[PDB]
Subunit: 182 residues, 6 copies
């Protein structure tokens, strides 16, 4: 059988999500830490994980990991293209619409997890909320909502890491080490 | 047994199409958000989706996704090469010709969808109209036509997202959740 | 059963050929539009089409698409590297020699299409003429020849798009929708 | 029968870990040597090793190598992007948080090695300690903790190289040349 | 069966070899024409052709095309790195030693073609001579020898194109259209 | 039935090794020639050769070629990043440690070759000595030792080219043309 690529994808998503949202929560400025993780781990590694779902027959995983890997690359390009003299910093309402579209994608995909493990359902539920809060905060110009999105993002990202490690450990031992609501 | 890559390609197309046409409908200036999405999601991710149709034996999909993924990359390059000092701003009538060719491609391909899902037919019909109106708009320098094109693009993009999530959810549940006319 | 990559390659070639030759025919200056298309569609997408011919066992398509995809990339690089301070602007006679070699390649490959669809023969015949005229035009500094070449290029590019869409539609419907002059029982 | 990619991944990880922690232990400044190795060997080569685990059915190795290859790339990018004018220099507490998350990942993965070779358990145990100490050191601004972490890192890196070469030699000779504590009949 | 990648490799090699050596012969300065062809066709396309020889079981082709594809990329980097402020223009004696090493490689590989088609033997014989002349010319500082190498390079490159097209046409028609001394 | 990729990797290693050590033996300054070869032939092509050993079931080769290909890329980056304004010139004692680690790797791998061709054993033994002498040389700042290392490197590189062409020619003729102790 082929390896399970989902833990790779979940880890890249989860760790990067936590780091971005430590900034959104207001602990840190928008550091190169986030941008670096967005490029290689949330971005490129997650895209690998999505592509690896193809031969596994997993349409959901292919769609999800490759899309959110692409999300991270788009976010980093949005943030860095002004540093390169290519564009201006984005209009925050337009950024909100973009985050909103990612939220709508996530909401539909959430309904797709309802016949899957509860842990995965929670990843997509909290991710839907995260995008919705980030979309609102940017469209309304409400920094308090962004701060709260940040905290939600910490839980979202942590839950993805939990799921990833539950999948690795449960496979390694051939039993439920970490329950993921299978 | 291979995964379905069409939702990936349709999502990349659909999201990026909506974002471009929020600018065309007159809500926002064109900034990095559109370009970032054009590079990585409407562009590269859609190209991945096209190449993944090869082993699925799907010529239409290989042709459509890889081409429209290429389209997004060409449009982004057209708009950023002037910022890089490599070219000057594109000629609008020339750009109109370029858009018209993409429209002609889309019209031929629309007749290809008559054998496929009704929702896919709507995507290609509305996409044909979108390219035609953006072509006329740029050639004739008619901003009112671009604006109408914008609204058509919002509907086109949304319909693509609808079909993508229909495909994912109908496969996840093993039954028609969202009717797409298949 | 693997997908047919030829329409992709033909589309990338055809669209890009048309845009370039709108310039050659004198309608527009050489624009970012041409360069962008040369990089990604005439270029990279056509290279993908060529590589996809390998597992289909199609030596001719592997050779053709990957080569002409490379042509488009070399052409964009010739034009942009001076903007990057990497090179000086190209010598016109040397450009003519380069176009001439692409022409010679195309002439030989044309003979490889004699058993293939008529529409594909037309693509390679007009392409041979297109390269020969561009080669002469640049070597001899004859703008009128370039303008004629431009028109031939529009026809060439358009015939490739026609062939691409015929292959797609004919496969989608499981019968001939757009006649492309497939060889059947009549000997070539 | 596919080759074993683990020695490649372990070597890239191990060498790069040693060089970084020669800096952490206070022997050298943070040099291009570390960054170069982080990009290509700890980084890209380790990513190749991870991807090669997919067809071997090895979820643990796919997850581990591709993740820690990405770690090395993110670390080099954090350090070089300010030189490129793309970002400002990293916040030390935020770097500590990042190192801490890598530490948490490593701790969970350590438990995944309990049925694997003892030498691999040692690699993941020392790596967990290594990340925890680097995390604390940066968060608390304690140089002494960083220096201790550095020494632990030399041991960690060295044990990975030992394990890599054991796997290579033991396979080459078809028997144990370097004991790595493979599980056999004794229950774990 | 898998496609034959040799004509691709031979074409990329052959066309690029002709263009470089129109300069070496003294017709033209060392134009971007050559550098562009060296990057994408003599370089990258030829590397593809080499990699495609792997599943064909062809050790000779894998070794030859991938190596000479790499040759072209090294030559272009040598020529462009000074334009990028990275290095000085190369020491010509050192360039000669480098060309000499490529000549030695080519000489051994020539002996490997002796049980293969005569046309291929001539490609490698003329290529050996080409490198030897370019090596001498640069080490001795003799521009006349470089000029003659240039002319030899035209014949070498043309012979590779001839072989490539002989392989394509002979396969297309299932007979000897162009004789290649099989 | 897959092609043998070892000649490719050995050639990339061998040529680039000879060129580097013409500088170390004191004939030339280090210029773009070495760096170009380090990037594309000693580097990338050797990496290709390593990855191609995977499906051949050859762990030693996957490990050796991909690692030494990576080595060349790291050395080139070390030397060019200062020219790019990204780092300062490397610390020689640090560089010595780095070279020593590569030597330690090479020594372990040498014991791996005792099961393989005698010519390959010579490549790894001489490579072990080369790394050891370059390490000592840089650490101790002893230029005489670097010089001796240079000559050892010329012999090491040449032996690699010999083995590569032995492998190609012995396979082409189906018999031992160049004895390599297999
Ligand atoms: C690949 C990672 C690069 C992500 C950053 C980025 O793409 O910005 C540069 C690019 O957008 C300009 O063409
Ligand atoms: C410094 C890094 C900041 C810590 C991130 C928050 C982690 C705590 C949240 C844990 C959590 O919610 O796990 C969810 C998971 O168990 C779902 O079942
Ligand atoms: C990193 C991926 C970015 C893709 C290229 C973005 C569009 C572009 O500007 O390319 C054209 C120009 O770069 C030609 O060198
Ligand atoms: C100038 C643009 C030419 C557009 C003509 C494209 C029409 C394609 C077509 O007629 O196919 C219809 C056929 O599929 C009916 O089944
Ligand atoms: C604005 C959103 C666009 C909706 C997409 C069009 C839906 C569609 O075509 O569904 C086909 C299906 O209803 C056939 O029964
Ligand atoms: C001062 C240096 C300015 C430019 C340096 C950029 C590095 C590019 C290296 C190779 C150049 C190149 O391939 O450009 C061709 C490009 O158009 C490909 O489409
Ligand atoms: C003053 C120069 C006038 C005579 C030189 C013209 C050379 C024409 C080049 C040419 O037509 O080659 C293209 C042909 O090979 C394609 O089959
Ligand atoms: C003014 C712009 C100067 C630099 C622009 C270069 C484009 C790079 C885009 C992404 C940056 C990046 O990924 O650097 C990380 C690098 O260290 C990867 O190892
Ligand atoms: C003043 C701040 C002092 C207390 C903060 C120290 C936090 C330590 C972080 C840490 O050790 O995490 C690593 C651990 O998660 C790896 O398993
Ligand atoms: C890939 C084609 C690039 C060839 C030119 C080149 O590599 O020069 C730039 C590079 O050497 C500097 O890192
Ligand atoms: C402008 C391009 C310059 C023309 C390049 C020289 C081509 C003539 C050489 C033809 C040739 O030697 O073919 C060799 C081949 O037949 C070996 O059997
Ligand atoms: C084109 C391929 C060139 C490979 C990179 C050459 C070495 C190098 O300088 O990379 C390190 C530096 O670029 C980090 O951004
Ligand atoms: C400090 C550097 C440590 C070097 C020790 C490596 C020796 C490897 C070894 O002893 O293996 C020998 C074994 O293969 C005999 O068959
Ligand atoms: C200077 C050139 C180095 C020659 C390589 C060493 C040759 C070699 O080891 O051959 C092994 C073979 O002779 C065993 O009978
Ligand atoms: C001021 C009022 C602004 C309203 C913005 C709407 C937020 C977008 C939320 C979309 C989330 C999709 C799930
Ligand atoms: C646009 C031109 C189309 C080419 C025509 C070739 C098709 C032949 C039909 C039999
Ligand atoms: C301008 C040249 C023709 C463009 C349209 C191509 C349609 C193909 C039939
Ligand atoms: C360097 C340290 C090596 C790790 C030792 C683990 C091997 C256990 C042997 C039984
Ligand atoms: C410095 C740390 C040790 C480096 C040598 C590693 C050898 C592996 C046994
Ligand atoms: C001045 C004398 C310079 C002698 C240079 C030797 C030329 C190198 C030829 C190697 C070709 C290998 C076949």
């Amino acid at each position: 059988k082929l390896a399970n690529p989902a833990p790779l994808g979940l880890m890249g998503f989860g760790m990067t999500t936590i780091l971005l949202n430590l900034h959104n929560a207001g602990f840190f400025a928008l550091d190169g830490i986030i941008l670096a993780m967005g490029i290689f781990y949330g971005g490129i590694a997650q895209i690998f994980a999505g592509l690896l779902e193809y031969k596994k027959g997993n349409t959901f995983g292919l769609t999800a990991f490759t899309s959110y890997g692409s999300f991270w690359l788009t976010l980093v390009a949005i943030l860095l293209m002004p540093k390169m003299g290519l564009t201006e910093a984005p209009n925050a309402q337009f950024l909100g619409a973009y985050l909103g579209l990612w939220g709508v994608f996530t909401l539909f995909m959430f309904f797709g997890t309802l016949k899957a493990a509860r842990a995965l359902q929670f990843v997509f539920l909290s991710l839907t909320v995260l995008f919705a809060l980030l979309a609102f905060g940017n469209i309304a110009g409400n920094e308090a909502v962004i701060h709260v999105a940040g905290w939600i993002g910490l839980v979202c990202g942590a839950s993805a890491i939990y799921l990833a490690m539950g999948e690795v450990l449960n496979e390694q031992f051939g039993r439920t080490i970490l329950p993921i609501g299978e």
